[PDB]
Amino acid sequence: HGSMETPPSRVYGCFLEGPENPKSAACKAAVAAGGTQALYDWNGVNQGNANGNHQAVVPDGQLCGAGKALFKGLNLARSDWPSTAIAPDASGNFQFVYKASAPHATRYFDFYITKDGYNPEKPLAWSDLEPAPFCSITSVKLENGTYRMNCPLPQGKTGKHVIYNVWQRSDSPEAFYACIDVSFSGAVANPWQALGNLRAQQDLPAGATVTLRLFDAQGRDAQRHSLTLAQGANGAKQWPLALAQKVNQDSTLVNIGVLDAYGAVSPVASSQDNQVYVRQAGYRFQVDIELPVEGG
Ligand SMILES: [N+]
Ligand SMILES: [N+]
Ligand SMILES: [N+]
């Protein structure tokens, strides 16, 4: 039993946050979806009778949850799942650190990687992953409750990806699954660039709708994201964050919030401090406001 800690699997992550008080939107939406109980049984994302035929026992659309109704909340298709940014060493490899709360005999440690062009918003299916694993570990030694394996990192990848780790025990027929959300650096520097400030002059009436349009370098419609503000989200120090959360969730092309040293953009409960970032130049954005229809 266990999962990856370096990098953190999607389940280890949500849990290091604090199941009883999630911090990231994805994790909040995960506990609201499948309960807090799954986040504690974080070691049992498994299939007792895989026998090496994971493709026949893990249903499409529930890979992150091994089709276990308990972990239903892990299969959410979102663009904001917290993710580790990874890169190779001087030789192109990556040292994975798997945490085994119960060291059992090992058959293999297979690493799958989403195809080029993976779309976070489509629930992870087997065919969204590349056909054969990019790294196959066949013997390990324990070291302070973790299995450490050097792996050749796939080259040419770019953007947010999911590494799918399968651990097939040798002593029994069961295996464990780990959706690791990673993020690759392209062949060209892709630093988040700020475009404007998602500023709020005064509060908006409850039920009004707030729309953010994004235009590319050629003034073409790039993306659109709308959000009707329920009571309590219409505050001036509230709605800019409410919109910045709907944006980050549905999109990886534009992110609204605060940039940190690592390179991540997380919003804030601020009236002015929320910023609109895009990984290309010359982009522009507009904020439109539909007011609640009046009349009988
Ligand atoms: N077990
Ligand atoms: N691919
Ligand atoms: N959504």
Author numbering: 1 to 296
What does the report in the manuscript say about this coordinate set?
Pseudomonas aeruginosa secretes diverse proteins via its type 2 secretion system, including a 39 kDa chitin-binding protein, CbpD. CbpD has recently been shown to be a lytic polysaccharide monooxygenase active on chitin and to contribute substantially to virulence. LPMOs are further characterized by a solvent-exposed Peisach–Blumberg type 2 copper active site in which a mononuclear copper ion is coordinated in a T-shape by a histidine brace comprising the N-terminal amine and two histidines.
Residues 297–374 (the remainder of the linker and the CBM73 domain) were not visible in the electron-density map. All LPMOs have the Glu (sometimes Gln) which is required for enzymatic activity, likely by coordinating H2O2 and reactive oxygen species intermediates. CbpD contains an analogous amino-acid pair Asn46–Glu174, but notably the two amino acids are swapped, a feature that is also present in CjLPMO10A. The maintenance of the polar interaction between the side chains and the proximity of Glu174 to the active site imply that Glu174/Asn46 may also gate the access of cosubstrates or electron donors to the active site when CbpD is bound to crystalline chitin.
